[PDB]
């Protein structure tokens, strides 16, 4: 999970980015 405006990463599913 993460924060309002975030989601998994392309090829790395541990940290966030933008929504």
- Both structure tokens of 5: 């405006």
Proportion of the chain in helix, strand, coil states, percent, rounded to 5: 0, 10, 90
How far is Cα 18 from Cα 13, in angstroms, rounded to an integer? 14
Q: Where are the beta strands (DSSP E) in the chain?
A: none
Is residue 18 classed exposed, middle or buried when 0-12, 13-18 and 19+ CB atoms within 10 A define those classes?
exposed
How far is Cα 2 from Cα 19, in angstroms, rounded to an integer? 10
How far is Cα 8 from Cα 6, in angstroms, rounded to an integer? 7
Closest CA to 19 of 10, 3, 7, 1: 7
How far is Cα 11 from Cα 4, in angstroms, rounded to an integer? 22
């Amino acid at each position: 999970v993460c924060a309002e405006g975030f989601a998994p990463i392309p090829g790395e599913p541990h940290r966030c980015q933008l929504f």
